[PDB]
Design a protein around this ligand. Structure first.
Ligand SMILES: Cc1cc2nc3c(=O)[nH]c(=O)nc-3n(C[C@H](O)[C@H](O)[C@H](O)COP(=O)(O)OP(=O)(O)OC[C@H]3O[C@@H](n4cnc5c(N)ncnc54)[C@H](O)[C@@H]3O)c2cc1C
Ligand SMILES: Cc1cc2nc3c(=O)[nH]c(=O)nc-3n(C[C@H](O)[C@H](O)[C@H](O)COP(=O)(O)OP(=O)(O)OC[C@H]3O[C@@H](n4cnc5c(N)ncnc54)[C@H](O)[C@@H]3O)c2cc1C
Lengths: 482, 479, 482, 482
């Protein structure tokens, strides 16, 4: 066939489905996935069109991090026309995809100086280098916020043209745009990709059916590598993707008000962060926790709910304390084991992957969709996505020393972000006693690969059998690629 | 007979009527959504001794309410047997625990927690209830933060818990088995004339005729009857004691063998864990008196419930999965006591205003009202709690003003806050004047209990003025 | 006689004694006061040469406040030659009066936004208006500091040429300079100023002696008005001076190090503040608490010691935690009831006053000394110190409404500066319940006079009899002047 | 007659001096030490006549601990007649040695359950086994206390006949009683004990003099072993004594009141504890911190002052917050390296030691004095003090496993006693990461000796060179005794 099957109905699957359907009107594109969107990252997202807000000192200190940042800056330029093209298929009554145009990044002292101070400086530097319009503003000039004075910001950065979308209205607009362009929605899950003679034949679905295709695009979020790893050799050639389990909430504000901009901190301990995304109709979105889990989890923990609520009420608006909780949302950020996305072609003809985007796949979606569609048409797509090809040796973007410094810093940051109150000698004591055990873990896991801090903490506190299984995985990957 | 309401009280009275008068047709109103419903949000504890406070037992009305709770406990074993008998193994067990441990920690006000622990011990000794003060080290399962840990623990034997959801399912099943009819609509209006009930207009526009109407509509019960001539100032108002609770799947599927609880805390909230089947635990429960109904938890309520349970009961709950946040309205009577029995309108009955322990008292209250409807005298000590009455004044204005300041300070100590050491005394001195001024302004004769007085203090001027008018109209009607 | 008696041996008494002795070599000047310096402000002082560091929004919102600030800026220019003139009378072995040239003002969130944010902006504005050399600098560039990250500064302001002196070396240099200029030190206290026919005759001392004089200069710190109030009518003509009881400490640092600059916050709740003043020999000075007391107190409270130590260890340097406490110091800032100093002549011929300087008499001392000496010589002294003449109706520098707003703000700031951790509804509840009782107190005390916030809180929590005595005092002042 | 020199003027030196002078009319006794009492434990002590109040589960789990406890119970019986015999040499105007007859032990949650709950049970058990008069009482029945409700006791234990003395009045009474009995006070320090042919000749003093004697009793507190270690072989034969540096304070209460009983907790992290000892004249004593230091320290750290004040104001009486600080006191508890006292004779003829009594030498003083005086007269003194002879191999009273469990428990207790506020997973994480490094230190120090927890934490955080010097010391002790 020349038929295309997109496996997955998040932002990435639907974005690539829309681009394929619009640019190849001669081909039949079928998109799989159920309206429940189990473990789905996209429906749990605010979401911020985060490019500069996602900048950390640690990310920009590596070549792979600077490459990822460059792609985020490129994606931002596509959003205005992308939104126009999606709203064009609907009417006023469908709601607006865009919920804010601008972002304010706040700097408070409810966190580690080694993350928050370093990251604020890195955001300012990235904005200056990219010639992005921005201004450091008086905190008194930030509208709406009403923090606890002991939790208040002392610096604020207004980023112009870095905004937010309603993730639910975006998903509805993508489905509507996909159908308008001739796409077919088949609400079942793929169980298996069938291939032989190094070529895709199609997909077995969970209702027992077989769908033939010349092209299969896997955009199944955190399930994407588990689906492809079934094919010969690919188990140690496609980097593993884990569940970056994230908790967010929809709140009806006490007075129906909301801020005119996104409000956020820089990224905090183990890739969580605090933000408020404006919504229509007297609602605000607050996010968002992150915990890398070696198995999927579809429910918030008590700890996650309390940390999210406590940070938002103290650092953003005390009025949220008296506001009504409408929904606790949980989704899995696709967390790649080497810290970088899996975008492009495979050694299997007609097999494509769009996954492992962690915190900013939704932001990057229009760029990633256009990249993969260009490749499927025999083009070279977007420059700078080559290192993020899905079939690869694990990337080592940092030295083991850089990661060990990072994991101790992030561990200490879980204290400062709480925020804890301890005797003044205790933090230095904890730092000195954390270094040895993390160094020992890193040395034991592999002679060549080091997991990024977010994954390393999850491994440190996992069962012995899960640790031993990872040592075996790293050894098998090393064997395959060396 | 029409029963208006499908909580524990409506269904309990429906079951008793259907079982004891097989000759009469009983129809029970209410929707499966159970909007603002207290019963489905309840754990629930069969709380008699666990509900004891020094303040309650210092009043005659409080001691009378406590006596009825002790009496109700004796009915539960045969009541549960009679409800499970209409089902099979697959329906699950109503009883989830036989015993309760009351814990005393320092995450609260000495003026509430220390006084209330002593009052519970005294009530157990006076009632000859089986109990013993035990070593905290001997309490199984708990894993508190050491800075939030109990230093005293009290094991109460035969004071247990039921699964409120399995109880509601068992009551509906038992009601149908006894010939009851479930009509899933709400009453909009009780029709009466010549001082006699004719029946009920429903929200699908229909009219249902009846000689008897039993109102058990929880926090909506008085608003429904107040439409009838004169009754607006003769049936004490019932407000929403909005309560937040949660179902949690524990990290390891374990749970305690007993109820774990504190005594009642600031403005009639309290901390407890109720065992459930299938690796779930129930944690509760917040309380906030609202002058209007609210069906959603506030952020503050969720955080306080979770923070107290994780620190004071089990730190493992921190890593446990949140399955459900539950919200319900405890029917909060304006004079602090329930509304149980007959009316000046022939065939009009009320079962409401039970606040924290209607579910516990349900088998006793059901049998009381069914006896009255049969021309009996029901249960001896329920006469003062007749629904058509002047507002009860169970405490002096001075006792209530002391209580409201104590409870206000307890919201700090229960957080728990960390303040400069002069600040609490400063807050106490500056709280006394404004609460005394509010109490004096509201009425020359009536004083709302502390739980309601704080809600009135922080309500709009117009809501305060409407209450002054209500109290004046009640005084006019009864004096 | 043409003899001069200076009553008091603090910075003001000794500074005026030195200037009189140096400029009238024909007259005998005797200076009274004991080496114990009971309740003495000067020996408890760091001290900061604070002009811009003392700026608050509230002070600069009044004409009297702007006038006081102008005089502080003028005093700064006299310090270099004043220090030269004092060290000239000694040798290398006497040690250096100046301990730092520059000041860094730090902004953290361990306080009320309504004080700390407003005051930081006011300091920046005062520096810009005066064309003073200064720079807002990166907190990372502030040397030596090692704060708790949850208590850390996010903004820092370097003020050039605003420094510090060792108060003990200054007092020793002033005594030595006074003797070099022909002054006589008589270590007894004045019990009584004798006057008749509207003219000073001299001073009865506490050893029962009588010293004759044509001139008596009262610089007895917080005792100054109580001494002069004995003279006919002067009880209701010289504004009362109360004890601004201040606690400070000398600490030997863990490693003998100290910062190269003064480190300070702006003034905080009820005119306290946090600062570190460099000292020679591996010592640092930390200060300083403030509590207005209606009666003198010569000992620190436990609360004062804990608040001073807790703030310095968290907000400046955690290493101070392990440092050795050498001395807890207590002194009475002369706190004038109308908020302004008492400098110049009296209706009694030859009777002069130098007092009521509260937080910055030591800084202003060379200017105030030269002013009073000019007046004693028939000059007009320094322009703008005429409004601060000691014999006056009480100044009303602010509206009752401004003071009631200030006293509630400062009350709440005692919480935020602790810092407390409270349920988020409690602060607004406390603010609403504080307003009524402070308004009631202000209305009860007088129809015309309102005490500044620092004094109003002391009166609020004083005995009924002390309140009633103040109502009588205000009534008697009103009678005398209207 | 025959000369005796007592080296040291604390409770032990003066108690033995009084007993010798009273009982030995044949002997001339001279007692050395200065009125400054540098590093002196006794003047910094409250002091509690602590027998049952000093009970811990850990102490009573060892044979040596139970033996030490038995001696404390015996000492209590001597105090009434001892006090009579000392007050008899004075008049009413000298003041009363006894300040309280009874003690209340309070149990609150501002500490580790593994110390405070275990120790409360151990105190109850020791009282029941001894048939001591006591009762567990309602906290509401404890007079005077006004704790923060979040810091309040929930259990209280009244111990009858376990009281307190004023340490300053005791020292004055001992000096007066010593002089009345013919003792000579020579206010110089010993620099050197001279011996040859295995016999004491006398003492070189720090004024360069030599005093001849047949008998030298060393009771120089924490300096006792350093003084004798100069003599041949004795460096590895007299267990080292370190400085258990303790901070306490005298406070004038807001209203002149005080409690009628001692108020105390059981012993807390690394042998500190919280207590209030009644004093006459509107003063109370609060104590007391403890930190084992490898070198003497004569000044309180900021941390010590804050922890003492914070615990007393929260857990005992909030009124202490507004009370006046009269004195911060610092003294060195003589801390023996093997955890037990050094009482009795030496291999050097006429050389005796009374030291290493740590927390309860003052309580035991009448018993210890009578023991040593009996031995010096050719008696056998008190049964059960033989195991505490000063010339010995280091005692090993606990297994390495017991001490490693204890040191981790005590480390965690420094957090719970603060009290800290941390995320709920942090304590378990700290416990797991503390175990390895303490086990490694214990293994490195010696194959045979393990320092008790109080000393082990001091060694853990000492310089590498101090650790290496201790490894050498332990090796040299092993060589000498095996
Ligand atoms: C968080 C929480 C915890 C609790 N824990 C306990 C506990 O541990 N122990 C205990 O004994 N009790 C507990 N209770 C409940 C307490 O006992 C209540 O007083 C009791 O449940 C009230 O029962 P009810 O049947 O009167 O009211 P509800 O349970 O409110 O039932 C009233 C019903 O009437 C319906 N209704 C309303 N208007 C109409 C209408 N017009 N027509 C028809 N139907 C209508 C409502 O939708 C609702 O379903 C708890 C309650 C809450 C909220
Ligand atoms: C804060 C604190 C609280 C305490 N609380 C209690 C309590 O409640 N109950 C209790 O029973 N005990 C208490 N103690 C004391 C404890 O019992 C001690 O073990 C005991 O006081 C030790 O007495 P000592 O005479 O051996 O030593 P010290 O009291 O130290 O006396 C030794 C003396 O010898 C002098 N000296 C040193 N070197 C020389 C030299 N070369 N020549 C001459 N003199 C020299 C020193 O200057 C000093 O005065 C406390 C101690 C401290 C520090």
């Amino acid at each position: 066939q020349t038929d295309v099957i997109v496996v997955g109905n998040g932002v990435l699957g639907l974005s690539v489905g829309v681009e394929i359907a619009r640019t190849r009107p001669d081909v039949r594109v079928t998109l799989l996935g159920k309206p429940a969107r189990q473990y789905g990252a996209t429906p749990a997202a605010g979401a911020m069109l985060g490019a500069f807000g996602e900048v950390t000192a640690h990310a920009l200190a590596s070549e792979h991090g600077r490459k990822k940042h460059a792609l985020a800056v490129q994606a931002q330029r596509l959003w205005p026309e992308w939104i126009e093209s999606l709203e064009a298929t609907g009417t006023a009554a469908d709601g607006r995809i865009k919920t804010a145009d601008d972002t304010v990044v706040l700097l408070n002292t409810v966190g580690h100086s080694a993350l928050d101070d370093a990251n604020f400086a890195a955001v300012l530097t990235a904005l200056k280098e990219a010639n992005a319009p921005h201004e450091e503003i008086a905190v008194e000039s930030v509208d709406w916020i009403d923090p606890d004075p002991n939790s208040r910001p002392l610096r604020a950065l207004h980023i112009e043209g870095e905004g937010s979308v309603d993730s639910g209205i975006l998903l509805a607009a993508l489905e509507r745009s996909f159908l308008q362009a001739g796409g077919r929605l088949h609400p079942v899950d793929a169980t298996e990709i069938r291939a032989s003679h190094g070529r895709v034949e199609g997909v077995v679905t969970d209702d027992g059916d077989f769908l033939p295709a010349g092209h299969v695009v896997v955009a199944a979020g955190a399930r994407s590598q588990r689906l492809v790893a079934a094919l010969p050799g690919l188990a140690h050639r496609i980097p593993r993707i884990y569940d970056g389990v994230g908790v967010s909430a929809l709140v009806d504000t006490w007075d129906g008000s909301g801020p005119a901009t996104v409000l956020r901190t820089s990224n905090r301990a183990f890739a969580c962060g605090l933000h408020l995304v404006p919504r229509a109709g007297g609602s605000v979105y607050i996010g968002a926790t992150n915990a890398v889990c070696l198995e999927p989890r579809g429910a918030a923990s008590i700890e996650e709910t309390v940390a999210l609520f406590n940070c938002a009420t103290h650092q953003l608006h005390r009025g949220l304390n008296g506001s009504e909780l409408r929904k606790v949302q949980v989704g899995s950020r696709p967390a790649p084991i080497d810290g970088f996305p899996l975008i492009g072609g495979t050694s299997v003809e007609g097999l494509w992957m769009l996954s492992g985007t962690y915190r900013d796949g939704l932001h990057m979606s229009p760029l990633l969709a256009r990249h993969v569609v260009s490749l499927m048409d025999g083009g070279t797509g977007v420059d700078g996505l080559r290192e993020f090809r899905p079939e690869r040796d694990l990337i080592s973007a940092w030295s083991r020393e850089e990661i060990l410094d990072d994991v101790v810093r992030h561990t200490m940051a879980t204290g400062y972000e709480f925020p804890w109150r301890l005797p003044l000698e205790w933090p230095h004591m904890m730092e000195t006693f954390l270094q040895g055990p993390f160094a020992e873990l890193a040395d034991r896991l592999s002679d060549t690969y080091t997991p990024p801090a977010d994954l390393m903490t999850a491994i440190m506190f996992s069962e012995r059998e899960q640790q031993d299984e990872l040592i075996a995985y790293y050894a098998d990957v090393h064997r395959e690629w060396h």
